Amino acid sequence: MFNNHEIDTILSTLRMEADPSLHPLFEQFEKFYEEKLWFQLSESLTKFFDDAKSTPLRLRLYDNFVSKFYDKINQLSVVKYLLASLKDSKDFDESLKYLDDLKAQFQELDSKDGILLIDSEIARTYLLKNDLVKARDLLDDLEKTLDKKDSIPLRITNSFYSTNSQYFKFKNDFNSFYYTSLLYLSTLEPSTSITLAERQQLAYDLSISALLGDKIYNFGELLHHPIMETIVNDSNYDWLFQLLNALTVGDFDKFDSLIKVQISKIPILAQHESFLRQKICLMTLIETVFVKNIRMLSFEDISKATHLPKDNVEHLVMRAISLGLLKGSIDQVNELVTISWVQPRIISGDQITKMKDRLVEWNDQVEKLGKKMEAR
Amino acid sequence: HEKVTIAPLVLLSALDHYERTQTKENKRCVGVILGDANSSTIRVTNSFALPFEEDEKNSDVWFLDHNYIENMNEMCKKINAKEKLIGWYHSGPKLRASDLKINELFKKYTQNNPLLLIVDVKQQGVGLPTDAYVAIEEKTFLHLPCTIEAEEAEEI
Amino acid sequence: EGKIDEAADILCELQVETYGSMEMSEKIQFILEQMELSILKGDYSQATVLSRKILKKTFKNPKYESLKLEYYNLLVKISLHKREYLEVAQYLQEIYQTDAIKSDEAKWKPVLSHIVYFLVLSPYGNLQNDLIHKIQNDNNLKKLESQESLVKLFTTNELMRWPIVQKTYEPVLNEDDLAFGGEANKHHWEDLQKRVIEHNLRVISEYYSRITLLRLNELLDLTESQTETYISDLVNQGIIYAKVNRPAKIVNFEKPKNSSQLLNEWSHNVDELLEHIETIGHLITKEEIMHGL
């Protein structure tokens, strides 16, 4: 197309001059490939535009002026694509083939900046999973590398978190992962234009990893942030949205209706929704119902007020940080929960005014006493 | 963390700077602060006017030279070895995005993350007419509380 | 010859008459063997002085894993007749650290697989509470995991679980004569009986203001006396609180309400502000100005 043909030649091509781009064999092969608007990732500002998703075999021809990458197009400039774009060529040996050539070239030849490649090469391996073992091992090195680093790119972690998520992505621990990816979104949050099939499907898997999180609930979340419409919409996002509904409603068969394989694939949410319903009931039962120095909630009818029954209360309510969360204790006899905090919460408008009132109340009144004492 | 000693000498001088520089609220008189920053309580020994220009008509437009600090520290070191650069001050009373630029320049010259110093040249509000910030980073910067020491020779 | 003591007795004297350890490597071997004969003897003490003297110097060797491992296994066998499992696994843990270095993890796991196992075998440990996660632990191939999952089964501990988990696990898990001397699993099981029960009481300790003996024995699957004893234990251990109440047939889990509390609590109520207004305050005006605009 114009971008490649017109851009490849005029683009750079000449950035850039008598290079391998517009060289005999060179200009042919694109023309040989196409002018047809799908292309090879076109050498600077337009390859800087072009991820172009016909596989670059200017694989070689990007790789020109890369000896000149000193004095030529120079930046990261490379895993900007290729190591990004042909990282997306999606083979097994492919990446591995250029993983040692790029990591040993842009780190040795050109070196003898790479850290973001160091992660790409390392990170990119981990897409291939190969074996969480080798992944995590150098991943944690990739992490361990990353640790001390003050790195202007989020791209490093935007590599890494995605990467480390990718690691957990192979795995459970979405408590980590979802969060880890939740981290990654907050990392992608400033930068990195992406695609929707990248956007939602991740955020899906994210929204999914909310489920295969589930959690220290959560409840409410990044759903606020533009994963929504975006994610939901529809398909399992309906669920994923309806699950957010169950993250509030907490009716089994408003959902255990909905359940197909994928969600029933982990049935443990049927426990998690009980975990929800309790906690879901609890949080507001906690957040408000007592306001009046909230604690007691003790137990049973209050615990059956979760509309989950009393002998499960004898577990669910009984369990506390055996829920991972709750504090306090049990009066078995009087059927009283002892409770304490480990409950966070939200909303606005209300105690706002109350706040300053008492706190200006003593305050003002103090001044009476607060009259002469150390003064006089 | 490293929350810091405060030097009245600094404080006063910095204001005479403000005075001397004829600085108005249109400007904030800026400069080096001195001490040794390693401890979880940093100490501020001294501090120095960085002759400077500030324009918030165009925020990022403002002028400062390091070569002071260059020439400065030499003498300062020669004056005292303990003077090692801990950070820097300005007037204030309050922050401007121009700061962050200014901030990281010292990061070149500082061991840890260097130190901002707010002053209230009008000394208005409260305990301190002062804040001291340190960049963190989504940027962060932060004020750890600080106070005066003895400095009894001063207190005398 | 079946000579035992005498055999040990001719060898009982090495450290002293013989080498001042002119060559340990030689000597340590028989120190070992003394320690070894000490076993057929049965007296650690022979082994002990030797043992306690020797091993750091193996580390102070260009450290020779064998000299560890050999001894480290004696050190185990020490620990074995000893049956002090923190210490047991602690020893393990030491050169267990060496045999990921030294051996593969694979050969090295069963140590761990026994180590945290020993840690669990131990009534508990405070380091065991640190030793809990390590990192790669649940070394992420074997299980090796229910082990730590039991370590995880702690904060949730029940003792509805006990016979369950027992039945649940004994491939080697409850069932170990290998590197642990449970002839029956009692040296796991029985020892672990209280052990779980022990830990069971902890979250129980946390989670009860009051409870009946029944509800306990209900959840605890035991007779009163046992229960009482286990109570009495940590009572006599002072590690928990309880009431000795037969008349109610109910145990106040109590509280030391005399800490005078509001001493700290109101000071903490102040600490709240010494947090809050101190914390919250510092940010706010800063915040919207940090936001500016």
Curated annotation (Swiss-Prot), chain A:
- Lineage: superkingdom: Eukaryota
Q: Which SUPFAM superfamilies match?
A: Winged helix' DNA-binding domain
* Ranges of residues in domain PCI: 176-344
Stored PROSITE patterns? PCI
- Residues annotated as transmembrane: none
A GO term for molecular function: structural molecule activity
Supply the InterPro entries for this chain. Answer: PCI_dom, PSD13_N, PSMD13, Rpn9_C, WH_DNA-bd_sf
Q: Which UniProt keywords apply?
A: Proteasome
Q: Name one GO biological process term.
A: proteasome assembly
Q: Name one GO cellular component term.
A: proteasome regulatory particle, lid subcomplex
What family is it from?
Answer: Belongs to the proteasome subunit S11 family.
The entry's other comment says: Present with 12400 molecules/cell in log phase SD medium.
Tell me, in a sentence or two, what this protein's role is.
Acts as a regulatory subunit of the 26S proteasome which is involved in the ATP-dependent degradation of ubiquitinated proteins.
The protein depicted here goes by the name 26S proteasome regulatory subunit RPN9
Name the gene for this chain: RPN9
UniProtKB/Swiss-Prot annotation, chain B:
Q: What is the residue range of the signal peptide feature?
A: none
* Superkingdom per UniProt: Eukaryota
| Domain annotation MPN: ranges | 4-137
Modification after translation is described as: N-acetylated by NAT1.
Further facts:
Present with 19800 molecules/cell in log phase SD medium.
Hey, which family's this protein in? Belongs to the peptidase M67A family.
Task: Report the protein's function.
Answer: Acts as a regulatory subunit of the 26S proteasome which is involved in the ATP-dependent degradation of ubiquitinated proteins.
Please identify the protein, giving its name as recorded.
Answer: 26S proteasome regulatory subunit RPN8
Organism, as annotated: Saccharomyces cerevisiae (strain ATCC 204508 / S288c) (Baker's yeast)
> In the record, what lineage is assigned to the organism producing the protein?
Eukaryota, Fungi, Dikarya, Ascomycota, Saccharomycotina
**What is this protein's gene name?**
RPN8
Residues represented out of the complete protein: 5 to 169 of 338
Swiss-Prot record, chain C:
Q: Name one GO biological process term.
A: protein deneddylation
Posttranslational modification, per the record? N-acetylated by NAT1.
Q: Which domain of life is it from?
A: Eukaryota
Give every PCI domain span.
84-258
Which cysteines form disulfides? none
Q: Does the keyword Manganese apply?
A: no
> One cellular component GO annotation, for this chain's record?
proteasome regulatory particle, lid subcomplex
Q: Which UniProt keywords apply?
A: Acetylation, Proteasome
Summarizing the function annotation, the protein's role is: Acts as a regulatory subunit of the 26S proteasome which is involved in the ATP-dependent degradation of ubiquitinated proteins.
Q: Per the similarity annotation, which family is this?
A: Belongs to the proteasome subunit p55 family.
Q: What else is known?
A: Present with 5710 molecules/cell in log phase SD medium.
Q: What is this protein called?
A: 26S proteasome regulatory subunit RPN5
Q: Which organism is it from?
A: Saccharomyces cerevisiae (strain ATCC 204508 / S288c)
The shown range, given as first to last of full length, is 150 to 442 of 445
